[PDB]
Amino acid sequence: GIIGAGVDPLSYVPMVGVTGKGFKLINKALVVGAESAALNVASEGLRTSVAGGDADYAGAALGGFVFGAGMSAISDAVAAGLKRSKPEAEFDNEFIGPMMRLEARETARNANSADLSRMNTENMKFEGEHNGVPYEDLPTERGAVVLHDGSVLSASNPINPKTLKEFSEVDPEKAARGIKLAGFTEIGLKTLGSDDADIRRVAIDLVRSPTGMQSGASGKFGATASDIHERLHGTDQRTYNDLYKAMSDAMKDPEFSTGGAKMSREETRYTIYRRAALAIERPELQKALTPSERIVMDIIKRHFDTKRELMENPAIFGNTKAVSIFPES
Amino acid sequence: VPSDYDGLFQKAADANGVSYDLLRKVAWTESRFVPTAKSKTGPLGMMQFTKATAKALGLRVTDGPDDDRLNPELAINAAAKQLAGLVGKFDGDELKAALAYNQGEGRLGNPQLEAYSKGDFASISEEGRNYMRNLLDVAKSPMAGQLETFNSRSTFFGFKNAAEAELSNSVAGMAFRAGRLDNGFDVFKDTITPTRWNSHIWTPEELEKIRTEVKNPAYINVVTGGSPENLDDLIKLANENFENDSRAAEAGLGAKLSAGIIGAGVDPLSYVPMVGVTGKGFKLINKALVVGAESAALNVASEGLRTSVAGGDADYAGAALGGFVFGAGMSAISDAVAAGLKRSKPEAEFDNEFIGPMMRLEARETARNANSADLSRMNTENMKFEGEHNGVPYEDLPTERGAVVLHDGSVLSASNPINPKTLKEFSEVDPEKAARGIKLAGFTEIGLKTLGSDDADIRRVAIDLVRSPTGMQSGASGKFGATASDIHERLHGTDQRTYNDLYKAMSDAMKDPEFSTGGAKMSREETRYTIYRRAALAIERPELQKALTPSERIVMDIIKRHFDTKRELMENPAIFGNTKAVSIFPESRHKGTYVPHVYDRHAKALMIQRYGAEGLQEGIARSWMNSYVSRPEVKARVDEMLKELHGVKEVTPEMVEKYAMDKAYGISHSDQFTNSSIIEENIEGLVGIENNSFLEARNLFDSDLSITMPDGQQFSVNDLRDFDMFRIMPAYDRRVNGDIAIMGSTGKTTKELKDEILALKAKAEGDGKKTGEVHALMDTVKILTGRARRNQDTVWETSLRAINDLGFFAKNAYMGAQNITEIAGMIVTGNVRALGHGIPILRDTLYKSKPVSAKELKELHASLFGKEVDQLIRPKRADIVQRLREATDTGPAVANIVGTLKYSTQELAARSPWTKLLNGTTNYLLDAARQGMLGDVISATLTGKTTRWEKEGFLRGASVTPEQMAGIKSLIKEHMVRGEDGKFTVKDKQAFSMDPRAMDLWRLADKVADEAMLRPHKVSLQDSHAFGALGKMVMQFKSFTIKSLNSKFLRTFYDGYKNNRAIDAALSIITSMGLAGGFYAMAAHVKAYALPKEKRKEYLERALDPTMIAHAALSRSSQLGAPLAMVDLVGGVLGFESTSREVMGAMGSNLLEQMPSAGFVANVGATLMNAAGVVNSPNKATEQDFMTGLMNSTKELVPNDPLTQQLVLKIYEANGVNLRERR
Amino acid sequence: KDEILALKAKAEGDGKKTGEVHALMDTVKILTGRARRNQDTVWETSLRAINDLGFFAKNAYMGAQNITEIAGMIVTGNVRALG
Amino acid sequence: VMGAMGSNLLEQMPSAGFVANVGATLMNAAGVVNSPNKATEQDFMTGLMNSTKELVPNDPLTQQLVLKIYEANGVNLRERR
Amino acid sequence: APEIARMPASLRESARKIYDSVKYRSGNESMAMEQMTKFLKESTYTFTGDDVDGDTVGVIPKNMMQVNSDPKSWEQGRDILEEARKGIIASNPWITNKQLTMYSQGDSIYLMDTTGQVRVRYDK
Amino acid sequence: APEIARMPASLRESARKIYDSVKYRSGNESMAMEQMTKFLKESTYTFTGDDVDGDTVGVIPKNMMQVNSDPKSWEQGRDILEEARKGIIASNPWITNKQLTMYSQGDSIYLMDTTGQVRVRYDK
């Protein structure tokens, strides 16, 4: 009970050693039906794949709860001060709704059942789709649409569809062409339906059809360019998350965090990356890396070795007449 | 009652955990079981909702028919999710959720829900109040009593209804008037509630934390008192409990029982659940029963128990303590039941049937631990013995039924698996299951027949293959080589030793937290498959080895060393005598460990259902070519082979592509390289002895890299491959040992030797003597190549012979072996008695000696045929069955079609609590239920009857389209013969297994079995009314499981400790043994009807008794996930079923031995023999090899945990036993 | 690239074929990374993925909502205070 | 649907057989080729947590410091409704 | 012990408090067990199977069997419940004395066999 | 307990001090629990729902509800707040009683659901 109990973080000591560790917000009350077994093997816990998950998440959650409760207290106090000037003025908290729903969600998440922050979706027509996500505007709370299951995303939630749509509609000079031109699904329908030999040949090589009347039984026994691109995106993204955790560990070492600030954070990142790269090029330097930088260098080396291996043998995918785009083997 | 949606309702209940009765009765009220119900208001659906619910939460991400149409599976799932949300939102109040469902919410719903909340049912509308009154029975609500206060009941006494209602002021009428039948019992809601730590599958991080920080992972399974909040507290509590139990064992139950379990009259029934007791401080030296008691052993043999695996004398102690507890408790149960029966009939004696064996077991164990003077030994004076099963004399005791006494006075009770009388009698009267086997001839017989009768070629081949034990010729220089027979024995011995090593390693590997601690990720069979597959993949790609836990690392090392040694013997078969022996190995210069390439029949069938023949072939070829282009070593070796083959200096990519296509043709269009056990089962003609399949499956490519198929899915040749080294390692060993023996003895290959023997037949087609000789030679080749077939019966007869030898020489090992087999016999006979009492169908029809009716005979024929058809068409790979069962759920399908994040089956799988909780029992019940369903469907189709599984809903639960069901009918009509009697037969057998529709048949049967039989949490008699003999037997077994879970001891144990794992182990053992006995009974009744009328009574009286049913249960009851088979761990050489000068020669042999095995002390845990060790190994199996094999083999039958033995005992006590009769 | 330019030159007449070859050209531009997805794809991709999580992974879904709501609180508090 | 099932039923790539590595996948070319093209749910979730690790501080102390800075500063409070 | 092995739900918390209190005051674990057993026996009736051993079919809290406000009238509800048990046994022969289980939910007494086929709910 | 659970958090430190004081005065933690619990009961009023299982919708300190200078005017403040809760539920039937929560901040009393719809401030 951070907010069910009316905790005021403003009247708190500087809270130095607190790192969030034994913080599982199960508020008693806000816990109705409460299963001990999860419904699926999915769900169960937080599905992160980095080490130390459920702990840095707990730290972020505790910091966010402290901040939001304190901001609610600040807004209430400022509203009282303004009411002193003009009693006939209400103002909006703008934090305590989101914070109450956040306590309810976290409570149900840790108690495993019955999110009480959820809206009653009866008599809601929804309508209004940003990217295929329906929502209802709440008149009660500014912005703050509600989703299909009853989950309500407040305004300024970075993902809620109405803020995203409005930001797209009114975005200052910074709105550009981007990727709005076309997508792979549209490309397949447009060009793989050509009835031309060369166009369809190139399309079969490049783009895969999600659903088509052709439905080729032996259209292509290869990966295709689209699937290769998407696979490489996925593998690169996983490697990026691995590198992100490794580099966070690397820049948390005493050299950059403890003493007087030797360089900026951007420079700590540059120095660690440069150490990894120089150690990759000259293996003699690897004995000079700390274990965290050693992990960073291993991740970067493995990534670049894998990329080189795919350039050298692009026939590991379907096409057998694919030969070594790598410049100098 | 059923209305074609029970499968869907049950699935949508297990997913979205909610009462199935709620959903079904909501269907009752809303629609009365029609998918589109015409209503004036506008709702049109199975659940009668258009409203806003429909689009509501579900859909909007997929082409939704919605307001106009709803997929019945999707409609039921969405309604179930809505009801689960309402039930959870209203704490657990089932009726409030029902009110919210019917009366809606918001406009008119919320005031009525509030009125319900404040009691105040008057404010609730009449419609909603009636709706709740309808649901009073199926709904669990705190408000149920208040609604009742605001009739199809069984009469307590007298006439129904009016007699007890209008009258009977006397108490009984009062109790009738306050009845309120509940009929809403859910075993997993009420009895076995899933905790947080049960049903929680670990993440890799939690797994590593558990592996590092938990001393004994089994202590994670217990949750005493309040549940620990986080895994760190669970680990701390587990370690504290482990240290406390280790500290307590010295004064614990093991120490207390180490003196006099049965001489002191200890009653294990009045005992606490024995949770921490692992039987470590348990040496039963009963004071008294110890007469003369030498402290020094007579020989270096004897001394201790001669097992060669590490941890022996400790797991033996656990098995002994569990067996002593179980046997003493079963004796107490027998006495109590006899007293209760003597209440009814005072002049009735009955038999304990346990206390004789237990008294003698205490005497043997006492003498074994005190080293001298077994007091269980009978006085053999005035005994003529006579009667030999395999050269072992015995005397029948009149005093004890069965229970013969051996030469030294050792008495083996009836149901002891090794006693000669039971083995002989089981051989004489065994249901259809007694086959040709290996009774044709043995190496000694062929040696005399062929090695010495006037023929240069015949004697040449015989001297090469068979060694003469004693002959008049006695050749001084007959052969300085190994001969095929000695090579065969040597390879059998080394394979058996490495099998015991692998058994120990795999047990350690699959006890680790990933498979044992948390919620049950996979079945035991599937854990075994995953570990074997991990080992094999790490062998093929060494980079994966860093991902193996140390236990799996040991497993992989054992498997790698075994396969490397086999390859080394096949490459150089001249390490034996013959110098002109050359490389039976197919493709050398491919330097790497060859894990045999065998491809699942059903994986190929799946890859043919889509991409029929050319698609699968070209996918295999393209994955191989991916390996070729990707890795330069693969390219190098393939190019070298192709240059050598085509005699061309350069290799074009066209050549390698054509080679890959030709090699993939063998996999895609032929089942030579598949499992194909049935074709090997046929032995006539010596056709398939040529062309070893394991060697021909060899190719130079790597099956590791995958190719994207035209539909976009990725296929790797490794996906086809069958791992698990349970059917794979033994079969590979049989074939390669045969080939190695042929080339090591004769310079010729298997093909050349076969051709020579056929030439000899053609030459001596005239003479009867010479034809008999060439036939004996052919039988030798057939035994040697492994065609043969030793049968299951060899394990216990081999054990009997070896234990007789131990009795002659190794006293302590002898007594330990007798103790373990006596414990196994008591376990199985207690199971037979208890389940003959409990499960009805057994006692009334199958365990009874009285012949069954004609209709019951037809049902038995159908059920046994269903079992046979299941063995024909079941997927062998455990992964395939698990994924097939899991994927059909709505979650995986919807995520595959609509989802933007991948997820994976076994994460979106619904999974019954029967699988999550109590996995092993559920696996046994699913197998039996699927076989029964197969038999039922086949019998109905041949007889023309339409099953209740024909209708749309149950097919929708599986993937059986309207069309595939018709195809299943056509397939059953084409390949099954309706006998004149109820007998069922198969046309062409293999051709039937070939049909793609057989996969659909199996899928239908398995999904119907699950949904209709295992998934529900309720057992009722009406449930057993529907199914046939096997179906109702397995349903009564499920009822027995539910009864046992509700027993006072088991309820108390689960409340105190949770620990679903221990209850699962106990009930799994019960179900395995009971299903074995039931199958034996059905086959025995069938065989009885096969006999003439007069002999049926004698045969059924002789073949249906507790002794033979118990021996059948010990015989089969194959543990599903047993690393390796019990036959492999202990199995004699197939050909080898059965003056002082030769003695002096053998002495001169063993004087000089200087091999490393003689010079060095044996390795602790893994011999890891190389080719030199195999060649230098003796052909005769040593006594420590037999003893470790016996302990490993019984590790499946006889549990090592005393706790599971106690749980089995208390289940039996709550059940009851039969007591025999009279004498 | 040369083949696609040759196809464009060949089918310079037909409007439909010019649209097709321009679609192929856009495919190559996307594929080689010319493209440019912009910063806005982060939150829209997160919205789609979090909707999918809400369909299938309850605990992950709720954790994602919690972290996004916390981010929104932090940024809106910053906007208010610095305004 | 049934085609996609018949595909995922057969998978025996090492990522399926083995438990995931703790802290670094270190994928090689075989792992990249055998990887699914669609991003899995754990990939998205770890990406989300890592990406927000910049926006949302992991230290409760810095959140308290930001909060007290804001308190000493003030808040607008919107108006009316 | 039937009262402690099958301790009903609310009496679990009451008994834990009594056990803890006596253990704290005396240190003796035997005194705490005797007091907690005394409380459970005074506050519950243990239904027993009228057999050689059908013993402990259930431990029901005494206030759940109570009819009217008189505390001593729990015996009337006990007689009703035992007549119910006998009627269930006699009506269904396949159920024996060992099959029945008596247990209490929050506000109800449940009398059921080992299977789930027969359950009758007795509420205040 | 409704007071020990939830707890107004304006009394958390005072209850801490009282628990310490009673534990040290009499070396008995049961007495310390009893005394700090009774302090919280005397200094706070527990609001309860209308349902039969009526649970605590909130615990508000007694002084915060006083309308006039009489210390017993917290009764009238309580009556006003109960009427306010009834009116909030009656005007918005969407809110099940379990959503609606009452708590006290440093100076004011808020009753609000587990959602941003309804939040009503009640100053002394």
Characteristics:
part of a larger assembly; 6 chains; A: about 325 residues; mainly alpha; three-stranded antiparallel sheet; about 45% helix; E: about 120 residues; alpha+beta; two-stranded antiparallel sheet; 4 helices
Task: Report on the architecture of this protein.
Chain A: It is found in: Virion; Host cell inner membrane. This is part of a larger assembly, with four copies of chain A and two copies of chain E (124 residues). Chain A has nine helices and three strands, in the order ααβββααααααα. Chain A is mainly alpha-helical and 329 residues long. Chain A is globular and about 80 Å long. With 124 residues, chain E is of the alpha+beta class. Helices cover 44% and strands 23% of the residues of chain E. Chains A and C meet through helix 1, helix 2, helix 3, helix 4 and helix 5 of A and helix 1, helix 2, helix 3 and helix 4 of C.
User: Strand share of the residues of chain A?
Assistant: under 5%
Distance between the termini of chain A: 63 Å
- Structural class category of chain A: mainly alpha
Per DSSP, the total helix count of chain E is 4
What percentage of the residues of chain E does DSSP assign to strands (E)?
A: 15-25%
Write down the overall geometry of chain E.
globular
Helix content of chain E: 40-55%
Order of helices and strands of chain E: HHHEEHEEE
Query: Biggest sheet of chain A: strands side by side, in what order?
Result: 1-2-3
Strand pairing plus helix content of chain E: what structural class?
alpha+beta
What's the alpha carbon Rg of chain E, rounded to whole Å? 16 Å
Oligomer status: part of a larger assembly
Classify the helix fraction of chain A into a percent range.
40-55%
Query: Which descriptor suits the 3D outline of chain A?
Result: globular
Biggest sheet architecture of chain E: 3 strands, antiparallel
> In DSSP terms, counting alpha (H) and pi (I) runs of 4 or more, how many helices of chain A?
9
Gyration radius of chain A, rounded: 27 Å
Number of strands of chain E: 5
| Count of extended strands of chain A | 3
Q: What is the succession of H and E elements of chain A?
A: HHEEEHHHHHHH
The largest sheet of chain E has its strands arranged as 3-4-5
Protein name (chain B): Peptidoglycan transglycosylase gp16
Subunit structure (chain B): Homotetramer. Interacts with gp15; after ejection the gp15-gp16 complex composed of a gp15 octamer and a gp16 tetramer probably binds both the viral DNA and the host inner membrane.
Enzyme class (chain B): lyase
Family (chain B): Belongs to the transglycosylase Slt family.
